[PDB]
Amino acid sequence: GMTEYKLVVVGACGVGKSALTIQLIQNHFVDEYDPTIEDSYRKQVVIDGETCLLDILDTAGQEEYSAMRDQYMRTGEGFLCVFAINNTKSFEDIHHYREQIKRVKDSEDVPMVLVGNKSDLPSRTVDTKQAQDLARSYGIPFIETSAKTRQGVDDAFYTLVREIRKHKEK
Numbered sequence: 001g002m003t004e005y006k007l008v009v010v011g012a013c014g015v016g017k018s019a020l021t022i023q024l025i026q027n028h029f030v031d032e033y034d035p036t037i038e039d040s041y042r043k044q045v046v047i048d049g050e051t052c053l054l055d056i057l058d059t060a061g062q063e064e065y066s067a068m069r070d071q072y073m074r075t076g077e078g079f080l081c082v083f084a085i086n087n088t089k090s091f092e093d094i095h096h097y098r099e100q101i102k103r104v105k106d107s108e109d110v111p112m113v114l115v116g117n118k119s120d121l122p123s124r125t126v127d128t129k130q131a132q133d134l135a136r137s138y139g140i141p142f143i144e145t146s147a148k149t150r151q152g153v154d155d156a157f158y159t160l161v162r163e164i165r166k167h168k169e170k
């Protein structure tokens with residue numbers, strides 16, 4: 001059938017991984033979605049004229065280092081590394097998620113996008129320049145999103161598929 005893209009959404013608890021995934025696939029904002037639910041969700045989309053299927057793993061729960069969890073994460077072809085623009089700690093944690101992804105993928109060149117979520121909020125603690133500089137330093141795109149208003153949500157996932165396509169074209 002059509003090309004499938006296994007995407008994995010990672011980042012600190014409470015940044016909006018579930019709200020972003022629900023908004024992308026179901027087209028509505030679910031506030032306070034159960035923080036413990038970790039599951040995969042499917043959506044057929046058209047990106048740059050090419051029809052494809054997105055299989056998105058919305059991660060949750062405890063930090064676990066096992067052969068099983070490493071292999072589950074290893075199935076990811078692209079990663080959305082999410083922080084909240086009003087939570088400095090979630091931004092400071094980004095390097096850790098990227099380190100674990102590079103470890104399980106056994107590569108420095110893994111399709112990835114840095115996502116700064118909750119752009120609708122007025123309490124910003126991480127400025128656009130700081131996040132743009134971090135993404136540039138990693139060689140990845142940076143997208144600001146709001147799972148609430150849908151601003152940047154499709155741009156973040158579509159950009160990640162484009163990174164996968166570009167990696168596969170190399």
Ligand SMILES: C[C@H]1CNCCCN1c1nccc(-c2noc([C@@]3(C)CCCc4sc(N)c(C#N)c43)n2)n1
Pocket residue numbers: 010059061062063064065066069070073093096097100101104
């Ligand atoms: C930032 C740290 C600091 N420690 C204190 C608590 C907060 N943290 C925390 N919490 C919860 C989860 C994680 C965390 N770090 O990587 C990951 C993921 C899922 C990403 C993809 C690649 C792999 S491979 C593997 N085995 C993973 C696992 N479990 C992961 N998840 N990190």
Ligand SMILES: Nc1nc2c(ncn2[C@@H]2O[C@H](COP(=O)(O)OP(=O)(O)O)[C@@H](O)[C@H]2O)c(=O)[nH]1
Pocket residue numbers: 011012013014015016017018019020030031032033034035117118119120121145146147148149
């Ligand atoms: N205002 C605002 N709140 C958001 C946004 N995304 C998520 N939230 C809220 O942030 C909290 C954590 O969201 P959630 O999807 O559970 O994050 P997760 O732990 O990364 O899955 C909830 O109270 C959501 O309502 C957003 O873009 N804007």
Ligand SMILES: [Mg+2]
Pocket residue numbers: 017018019033034035036037058059060
């Ligand atoms: Mg969640």
Ligand SMILES: [Mg+2]
Pocket residue numbers: none
């Ligand atoms: Mg909120």
